[PDB]
Design a protein around this ligand. Structure first.
Ligand SMILES: CCCCCCCC/C=C\CCCCCCCC(=O)O[C@@H](COC(=O)CCCCCCCCCCCCCCC)COP(=O)([O-])OCC[N+](C)(C)C
Ligand SMILES: CCCCCCCC/C=C\CCCCCCCC(=O)O[C@@H](COC(=O)CCCCCCCCCCCCCCC)COP(=O)([O-])OCC[N+](C)(C)C
Ligand SMILES: CCCCCCCC/C=C\CCCCCCCC(=O)O[C@@H](COC(=O)CCCCCCCCCCCCCCC)COP(=O)([O-])OCC[N+](C)(C)C
Ligand SMILES: CCCCCCCC/C=C\CCCCCCCC(=O)O[C@@H](COC(=O)CCCCCCCCCCCCCCC)COP(=O)([O-])OCC[N+](C)(C)C
Ligand SMILES: CCCCCCCC/C=C\CCCCCCCC(=O)O[C@@H](COC(=O)CCCCCCCCCCCCCCC)COP(=O)([O-])OCC[N+](C)(C)C
Ligand SMILES: CCCCCCCC/C=C\CCCCCCCC(=O)O[C@@H](COC(=O)CCCCCCCCCCCCCCC)COP(=O)([O-])OCC[N+](C)(C)C
Ligand SMILES: CCCCCCCC/C=C\CCCCCCCC(=O)O[C@@H](COC(=O)CCCCCCCCCCCCCCC)COP(=O)([O-])OCC[N+](C)(C)C
Ligand SMILES: CCCCCCCC/C=C\CCCCCCCC(=O)O[C@@H](COC(=O)CCCCCCCCCCCCCCC)COP(=O)([O-])OCC[N+](C)(C)C
Ligand SMILES: CCCCCCCC/C=C\CCCCCCCC(=O)O[C@@H](COC(=O)CCCCCCCCCCCCCCC)COP(=O)([O-])OCC[N+](C)(C)C
Ligand SMILES: CCCCCCCC/C=C\CCCCCCCC(=O)O[C@@H](COC(=O)CCCCCCCCCCCCCCC)COP(=O)([O-])OCC[N+](C)(C)C
Ligand SMILES: *[C@@H]1O[C@H](CO)[C@@H](O[C@@H]2O[C@H](CO)[C@@H](O)[C@H](O)[C@H]2NC(C)=O)[C@H](O)[C@H]1NC(C)=O
Ligand SMILES: *[C@@H]1O[C@H](CO)[C@@H](O[C@@H]2O[C@H](CO)[C@@H](O)[C@H](O)[C@H]2NC(C)=O)[C@H](O)[C@H]1NC(C)=O
Ligand SMILES: CC(C)CCC[C@@H](C)[C@H]1CC[C@H]2[C@@H]3CC=C4C[C@@H](O)CC[C@]4(C)[C@H]3CC[C@]12C
Ligand SMILES: CC(C)CCC[C@@H](C)[C@H]1CC[C@H]2[C@@H]3CC=C4C[C@@H](O)CC[C@]4(C)[C@H]3CC[C@]12C
Ligand SMILES: [Ca+2]
Lengths: 609, 156, 53
């Protein structure tokens, strides 16, 4: 096939619709696509294979509202030739799991990088489909290995594109591709979880440029912080992308002399200029300015919530005005309501268009559990607050005073934008497994020693028997646990402290230190030192991978803050309304010209060669 | 100037400046073949210590505010009526509890005169929150800091 | 496979725990080796059919 192509076969003339339908009609039988095609044409009762069936199978193998061109384009229903012969024969090759034929057809193609990323998506998704289904044969490791090969090819083409020209390669990553359902290469590289592609320098520099949305590259945090609240300083001290590009072009025109005698992506990647009012809205629309705003608003919330919890949270009495409620607590209700709205619109703006699928992908990351938990816990506390009864009021204030933990621990996501703290916070969650295993083994020793200790000190009936069930159950767990950290109860477990600890049995007075001594050998100088050894072992292995995981998560970070409301933390809820007005009325990419799209295809193809 | 307040300021300032004049000795110790490289290794480990303290400070303050809120209710009978001791106690007691100074008599019912009388429901919440804090501080973060130093020691 | 002696490969602990004390639930919810092998063979006989007609 390679030899026929490079001698005298032209796929524009060769491939008609009937040949393509004949190619899909004669799939082997031992492949993964054959059950999928049979199941698709099994429903809706169609006896002959056509491209609508193949389109729908390709659509369900790429779940994020993908739209295959077979379902819409007029050339694939039932002479002028087909629009993309190399692409759809390449798609047939990768769906049949033919390695060499797919490679041959990949090398003779228009978009190598996008095709490679789509291939890897298709392969690993049908691999997982083959794995989890009983009526499809498990060839999953073969499909994952083939997906990995296409991932390497995509990175290789990007690397060569980066080495030739660093700027236009970043433009290459944000091209609105027409043959891949208006989806860009960066989104394709996120759909298939390709960490090696996103971790590459070109993508990382692009993400930093998108983070600095229509704003100079070396604008520091404090300069943004000042200009966020004083919008009269927005024009003099903040530089922009047109200004630095004008300076570079004006310089480079002089170097050639002889020595003697919603349009943010456009203004980033074009020679567009900003007036006065444009570069105010463009400053507020930048992700980094929204982030700085979020941080200031979040600090205000924590101090406000810490004040009400520590100093002033009285009980509800109908006699006093407003129920004797300080305005602080009403401002707290306002901000928590703002966070609730933020989480609602984070749920609503997910890639799938099914409420179950939105919810399923919304609970993929573990922060959203903590978000919805802390918000639910807060609403329950404020519902319980108003009833004027000491028991449930005590329940209300305790629930708030424990919810402070979750709202403060939630700060670690805004700390994870840092280059150094980010990877460390990934390393911690990877060490939680070893901590869990340690605690299980420790719990077995703790409970063994605990039951023995309490049984020996306090006999079961008698004079020294403590006549209370709950304190017995809690003491078994309690005293062994504190004895780990050097709180040895040597006066207590021996004869002394009859009033505080309770009087011990005469034979318990000498058993207790002996059992303690043995417990202290097997706990402090064996298990704890073994835990140190386990962490040092796993730290190097996790060090290699946790950086890539942080690199990959920067896309979600940028995409999150790209979609956040425009206005600042104090008025952020007012800003939120404008999204509601836009929604009731009824993005990181650029549309190129046909001439430019042709030029970019030619340059990408030469880089692949 | 002959005034007790600013004289107290004078002697305190001298008695703290002794630290900097003694710590300045480490430059004359760094002419040695063996001690010199070690003193360079220390300043390269200060970055990892700084990152550790930031993460530790987040856990410390979370636990601190929760602990103090639960023990001493905001208005009422058990509310300590003093702003500065509240602000300093939130930071103080969680910090000493890292190094094995567990205030188990104090955070429970006992020591009403020294520590202050605790709320009846704080008497049983405080050890439970302490127990959780001691897992996530002593047997997770401190052991992780040991792992970080051993990793970076070879490279440095 | 010997550990899963004459019982489906993906039968979880709790399903066994329920069926151990309630032996009336033993038939409906516990799958077995013949059932999964019959399913695989019945599928693989169908995969050999032609895609058209
Ligand atoms: C009144 C006070 C207002 C203070 C506002 C601080 C503004 C933060 C933004 C910032 O500084 O950006 C920093 C980014 O790196 C980080 O953001 C890493 C995380 C640190 C920020 C959080 C600090 C603690 C406040 C939250 C605590 C929560 C409560 C915790 C309660 C326990 C630095 O950015 P830059 O280097 O200058 O950018 C230029 C280069 N670049 C664009 C190429 C990258
Ligand atoms: C050191 C590291 C800090 C770590 C954070 C420590 C956590 C605490 C900091 C965070 C919460 C902020 C609490 C302080 C603000 C409230 C002041 C106040 O109580 O008002 C008082 C006056 O005003 C005093 O100046 C009056 O008090 P009131 O009568 O009750 O009204
Ligand atoms: C009484 C009840 C109180 C219980 C309080 C316990 C509260 C438990 C809070 C659980 C949330 C932590 C996981 C966050 C997460 O989503 O994972 C992220 C990583 O997260 C990290 O960066 C490391 C997290 C370590 C925090 C360990 C718990 C802090 C306890 C503080 C101890 C203070 C003492 C408390 C007393 C990544 O998620 P993803 O990759 O995006 O998917
Ligand atoms: C996270 C910890 C849960 C936070 C939930 C917080 C919500 C709590 C709501 C219920 C509060 C009722 C208080 C009460 O009635 O006090 C009575 C006296 O109480 C005692 O003297 C102690 C008796 C044991 C308490 C229950 C077991 C505690 C340990 C196990 C608790 C698990 C009167
Ligand atoms: C209870 C609450 C207590 C109050 C706490 C409030 C504290 C207020 C804090 C205010 C100060 C905020 C400073 C943030 C800037 C950090 C330095 C920096 O620029 O990051 C640089 C790194 O730097 C390290 O090398 C670059 O980081 P990057 O670009 O992200 O990579
Ligand atoms: C509080 C009490 C302290 C004990 C309880 C708290 C300690 C943490 C609980 C961990 C839950 C299980 C778990 O996550 O699996 C973990 C591994 O461990 C296993 O897979 C072993 C499975 C047995 C779990 C039952 C332990 C009984 C604890 C009672 C022991 C006998 C008494 C890790 O999961 P991962 O997916 O690999 O990441
Ligand atoms: C490094 C530490 C700074 C050394 C500076 C050293 C120079 C100090 C010069 C001022 C000394 C004034 C002493 C005084 O007037 O005592 C009065 C009573 O003081 C008290 O009872 C305590 C009140 C709190 C003190 C201020 C906060 C201390 C913690 C935060 C301090 C930060 C009377
Ligand atoms: C508060 C104050 C308390 C009093 C403290 C006063 C203590 C007075 C101390 C007085 C004794 C000083 C001895 C210095 C000589 C060290 C040994 C030596 O020769 O160095 C050799 C190394 O040696 C190691 O291997 C060579 O070192 P190099 O050539 O540099 O390489
Ligand atoms: C005393 C209180 C204890 C906390 C304060 C003392 C702890 C040391 C302070 C370190 C200052 C920042 C710094 O040096 O960067 C360091 C990295 O860390 C970062 O780059 C994160 C940037 C956020 C810094 C603000 C932390 C707020 C602490 C409050 C946390 C929330 C409460 C290292 O810098 P380097 O250049 O890489 O070397
Ligand atoms: C009322 C309560 C009844 C609870 C019954 C638990 C049933 C245990 C069996 C079980 O879950 O199997 C687990 C196996 O892995 C293990 O068994 C590892 C050890 C954990 C089990 C012991 C838990 C602690 C109870 C004992 C403490 C002793 C007293 C300690 C006193 C200090 C999970 O099996 P599976 O994954 O679902 O299997 C499917 C996949 N597979 C077949 C391919 C493998
Ligand atoms: C727990 O209850 C037991 C049984 O009522 C008590 O044991 C008795 O104590 C009295 C007074 O010291 C003795 O005269 C009896 O001989 C004991 N009974 C038996 C069967 O030996 C015990 O005092 C109670 N303990 C506490 C701490 O309250
Ligand atoms: C802190 O101040 C509060 C308010 O003045 C005091 O609470 C009152 O204490 C008295 C005497 O025990 C009671 O009769 C009142 O019912 C309490 N007031 C309320 C509103 O409940 C409290 O005693 C002070 N605490 C300290 C430690 O000084
Ligand atoms: C570290 C090596 C040498 C093991 C030491 C074990 C020691 C600490 C253990 C083993 C036997 C124990 C002793 C057994 C008998 C007595 C007599 C009386 O006074 C009560 C405690 C006391 C004194 C115990 C103290 C702790 C003890 C001495
Ligand atoms: C190490 C493993 C087993 C976890 C142990 C957790 C223990 C130490 C925690 C969890 C629940 C806590 C108990 C909760 C209730 C009580 C009743 C009363 O007496 C106050 C403290 C006391 C007794 C607490 C002591 C500490 C405690 C027992
Ligand atoms: Ca969220």
């Amino acid at each position: 096939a390679e030899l026929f192509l490079q001698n005298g076969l032209s796929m524009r003339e060769f491939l008609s619709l009937d040949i393509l339908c004949k190619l899909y009609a004669e799939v082997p039988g031992n492949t993964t696509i054959k059950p999928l095609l049979q199941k698709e044409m099994g429903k809706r009762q169609v006896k002959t294979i056509d491209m609508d069936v193949v389109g729908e199978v390709i659509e369900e193998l790429m779940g994020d509202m993908f739209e295959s061109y077979y379902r819409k384009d007029g050339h694939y229903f039932g002479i002028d030739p087909l629009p993309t012969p190399y692409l759809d024969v390449f798609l047939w090759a990768v769906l049949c799991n033919r390695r060499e034929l797919a490679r041959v057809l990949w090398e003779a193609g228009r978009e190598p990088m996008a095709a490679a990323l789509m291939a890897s998506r298709l392969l690993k998704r049908m691999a997982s489909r083959a794995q989890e289904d009983n009526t499809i044969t498990d060839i999953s490791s073969d499909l994952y290995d083939h997906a990995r090969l296409f991932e390497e090819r995509a990175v290789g083409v990007l690397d060569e594109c980066f080495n030739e020209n660093e700027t236009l390669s970043q433009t290459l990553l944000v091209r609105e591709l027409d043959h891949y359902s208006r989806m860009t290469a960066l989104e394709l590289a996120v759909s298939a979880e390709s960490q090696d592609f996103i971790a590459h320098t070109s993508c990382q520099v692009l993400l930093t440029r998108l983070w600095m949305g229509t704003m100079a590259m070396n604008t520091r945090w404090w300069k943004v912080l000042v200009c966020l609240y004083l919008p009269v300083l927005i024009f003099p001290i903040i530089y922009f992308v047109p200004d630095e590009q004008h300076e570079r072009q004006a310089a480079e025109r002089e170097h050639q002399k002889s020595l003697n005698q919603d349009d943010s992506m456009e203004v980033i990647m074009r020679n567009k200029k900003l007036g006065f009012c444009d570069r105010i809205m463009h400053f507020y629309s930048a992700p980094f300015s929204k982030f700085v705003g979020n941080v200031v608003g979040y600090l205000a919330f924590i101090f406000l919530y810490a004040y009400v919890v520590l100093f002033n949270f009285p009980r509800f009495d109908p006699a006093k005005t407003l129920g004797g409620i300080h305005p602080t607590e009403i401002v707290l209700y306002f901000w928590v309501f703002t966070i609730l709205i933020e989480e609602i619109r984070q749920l609503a703006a997910k890639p799938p268009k099914y409420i179950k699928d939105k919810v399923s992908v919304y609970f993929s990351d573990t922060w959203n559990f903590v978000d919805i938990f802390s918000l639910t816990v807060f609403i329950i506390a404020i519902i319980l607050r108003f009833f004027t009864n000491s028991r449930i009021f005590t329940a209300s204030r305790i629930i708030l005073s424990l919810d402070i933990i979750f709202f403060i621990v939630r700060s670690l996501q805004i700390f994870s934008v840092n280059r150094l703290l980010g990877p460390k916070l990934v390393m911690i969650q990877k060490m939680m497994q070893d901590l869990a295993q340690f605690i299980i083994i420790l719990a077995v020793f703790t409970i063994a020693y605990g039951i023995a200790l309490h049984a020996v000190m306090f006999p079961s009936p008698g004079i020294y028997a403590r006549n209370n069930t709950w304190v017995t159950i809690t003491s078994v767990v309690q005293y062994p646990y504190w004895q780990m950290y050097g709180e040895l109860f040597l006066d207590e477990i021996q004869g002394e402290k009859p009033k505080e600890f309770g009087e011990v049995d005469p034979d318990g007075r000498w058993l207790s230190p002996l059992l303690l001594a043995i417990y202290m050998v097997f706990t402090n100088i064996l298990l704890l030192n073994l835990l140190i050894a386990i962490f040092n072992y796993t730290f190097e292995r996790v060090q290699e991978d946790s950086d890539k995981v942080w690199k990959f998560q920067r896309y979600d970070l940028v995409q999150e803050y790209h979609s956040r409301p425009v206005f600042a933390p104090p008025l952020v809820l007012l800003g939120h309304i404008l999204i509601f007005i836009r929604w009731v009325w009824r993005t990181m990419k650029i549309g190129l010209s046909p001439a430019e799209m042709e030029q970019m295809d030619n340059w990408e193809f030469q880089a692949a060669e």
